[PDB]
Ligand binder design. Structure first.
Ligand SMILES: O=C(O)c1cccc(Nc2nc(-c3ccccn3)cs2)c1
Length: 331
């Protein structure tokens, strides 16, 4: 027999109740603006899928950010655009302002609201205990929103969480890997950065859901409170699961594989070994103890579960004691 099916615990059928055009992005028609409205100022970054620039909208003198896409299948561009338009205006979601056809590359360019970024490699070393709870709460607002809208991000990691620390503002960016959740759909497991891939991706379990983003969030939280980046530091996708298993233990891993009748890649046989579940105290030391508390460890533990069905939802996470003071201040 094959793998046991799975469905999201929450927001399971939200896309089914929408009109088909909400999620049928292959049939999305792109609304193009005027590429002459924008003059590039300077380059801000580059990646495998795009280059990102500061630009000026010369019709109103507004600063914007322009993401010029490298060649990719048009259906992937339609996907990202449709998701950005669906999520526009949601809390802490980057705002897509315009779409233009770049004259040189002949590829699309997405135009986004400007947001000032403090690079995480400089910010994360100055964050207080309170800052981490605050910004984790703000990320959870974006994840609960997009999940409630039927969308999983699938690429949650520090580079995709832009933080203007001076104004305590945060935006979840790069929706190029995001997808619509449909019950029973089997998804590509070649998503997310290595260090943030959930166990379902590493064992090739395709019927995953929003809870994938909650694993990635737990990896971010561990790296911030323990000041260890990345927290699970694998050499490849196989070794990545080994690094997880040396912390979470192999017993719950094999229980997970058994529960969903997952056929484990035979490469894993010789490398996973047998490992006890470790106590989080072993990652606490004098340089990070001010960021670690019983509340943080309880919250972290409830995110980092092999069984995607047993991880906190974004809404459950927001109600955890770790956020009581953040919640009280925001009232
Ligand atoms: O893919 C996306 O959705 C997206 C949306 C907005 C921005 C970026 N990417 C980058 N933005 C910067 C940056 C740095 C300083 C000030 C402003 N932006 C550097 S890399 C990506």
């Amino acid at each position: 027999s094959g793998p046991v099916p799975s469905r999201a615990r929450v927001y399971t059928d939200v896309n089914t109740h929408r009109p088909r055009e909400y999620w049928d992005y292959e049939s999305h028609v792109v609304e193009w603006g005027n590429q002459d409205d924008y003059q590039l100022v300077r380059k801000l970054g580059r990646g495998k899928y795009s280059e990102v620039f500061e630009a000026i909208n010369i019709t109103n003198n507004e600063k914007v950010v322009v993401k010029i896409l490298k060649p990719v299948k048009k259906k992937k561009i339609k996907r990202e655009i449709k998701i950005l338009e669906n999520l526009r205006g949601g809390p802490n979601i980057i705002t897509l302002a315009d779409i233009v056809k770049d004259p040189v590359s002949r590829t699309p360019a997405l135009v986004f609201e400007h947001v000032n970024n403090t690079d995480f490699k400089q910010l994360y070393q100055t964050l207080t205990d309170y800052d981490i709870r605050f910004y984790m709460y703000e990320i959870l607002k974006a994840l609960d929103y997009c999940h409630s809208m039927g969308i999983m991000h699938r690429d949650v990691k520090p580079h995709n969480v832009m933080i203007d620390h001076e104004h305590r503002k945060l935006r979840l960016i790069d929706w190029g890997l995001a997808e619509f959740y449909h019950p029973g759909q089997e998804y590509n497991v070649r998503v997310a950065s290595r260090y943030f891939k959930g166990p379902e991706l590493l064992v090739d379990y395709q019927m995953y859901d929003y809870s994938l983003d909650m694993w990635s969030l737990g990896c971010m939280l561990a790296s911030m409170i323990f000041r260890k980046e990345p927290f699970f530091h694998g050499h490849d996708n196989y070794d990545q699961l080994v690094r997880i298993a040396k912390v979470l233990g192999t017993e719950d891993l094999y229980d997970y594989i058994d529960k969903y009748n997952i056929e484990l890649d035979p490469r894993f046989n010789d490398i996973l070994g047998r490992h006890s579940r470790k106590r989080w105290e072993r990652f606490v030391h004098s340089e990070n103890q001010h960021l670690v508390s019983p509340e943080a460890l309880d919250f972290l533990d409830k995110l980092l579960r092999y069984d995607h069905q047993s991880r906190l939802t974004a809404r459950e996470a927001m109600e955890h004691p770790y956020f009581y003071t953040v919640v009280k201040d925001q009232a």
